[PDB]
């Protein structure tokens with residue numbers, strides 16, 4: 001696969017041996033926390049142009065190739081976006097070549113020969129869904145092309161669609177790849193992209209999985225959207241075991257508790273989307289404690305505190321590890337009164353073998369013994385938040401979703417709630 005790399009863009013430069021030239025328009029935006037994330041908006045000046053050396057300009061009936069990239073597509077919210085295929089990554093020249101385009105709920109690959117014969121492959125996702133894996137969340141796209149079998153589109157390493165392409169003839173693509181919203185009716189539309197790559201082979205399923213795993217940066221925790229999780233940033237909490245609930249606090253202090261309540265409200269716009277509201281419940285803020293890194297990113301194994309916002313004031317998530325029973329009920333404590341109560345949380349994305357898990361917060365007692373991952377337990381019809389080593393034992397056996405599986409959801413411009 002490294003031998004197969006013919007374009008590999010990072011923050012912008014091409015790391016490949018072909019050293020593509022890259023030109024950015026005046027209205028490209030690079031994310032401050034992760035400069036590899038490039039945002040393109042619906043303006044003529046919001047462009048990236050990549051110029052490929054002659055040696056790798058595609059002009060063949062037979063040569064195989066693949067592309068991979070990550071994309072984050074804001075929720076479609078207005079009818080102007082319905083029935084509107086717009087190009088985003090264009091390598092067509094004189095009506096032959098390849099392009100990536102989007103439409104309402106779609107990511108589309110088009111491959112076109114010099115006789116105007118076209119094949120497409122399409123990933124479809126719904127916006128009428130409780131919780132989506134795709135809307136406004138980072139998606140890893142991979143498209144592979146084998147000239148004597150099929151074009152194939154993979155999403156997060158999984159095969160979605162494939163179509164025969166053996167009837168396509170010579171395909172003569174451009175020496176320029178234009179990253180630009182082209183033909184988009186919605187003035188507010190944008191995309192975010194990262195890690196654009198080309199390969200001079202059809203990638204195997206294993207290669208695709210390994211690319212997904214490696215480019216995921218699994219040593220850094222992620223928020224719900226797939227961005228790096230951060231310190232000093234307000235997050236709404238989603239429990240993946242029961243996504244219809246949200247967190248609330250029934251009194252501050254050590255006799256109070258946090259609990260899960262439901263149902264969530266709907267958010268909807270007729271014939272455009274119907275989802276659960278994400279911006280509900282008690283906000284959590286992760287506080288830097290042990291990390292010596294100067295940046296603001298939360299890494300696997302960082303020891304942190306968790307603050308909880310109650311009536312616009314920060315409290316400390318904590319428990320008395322000496323309480324009866326081994327499901328330790330969590331409370332929201334006044335920060336000056338926490339004392340030596342249990343409050344240090346080990347943040348987790350993956351285990352020592354590299355196996356990822358959505359269980360994020362492993363609470364420690366004051367002696368550094370695990371009290372357990374933070375999840376919930378039902379005490380007489382109330383689902384109270386607890387730390388429990390039951391989770392820790394289960395996470396050693398599988399990576400399935402458990403009650404300790406959480407997402408941290410910050411307010412993001414690609415998911416607007418009324």
Ligand code: NI
Pocket residue numbers: 327376377378388
């Ligand atoms: Ni329990």
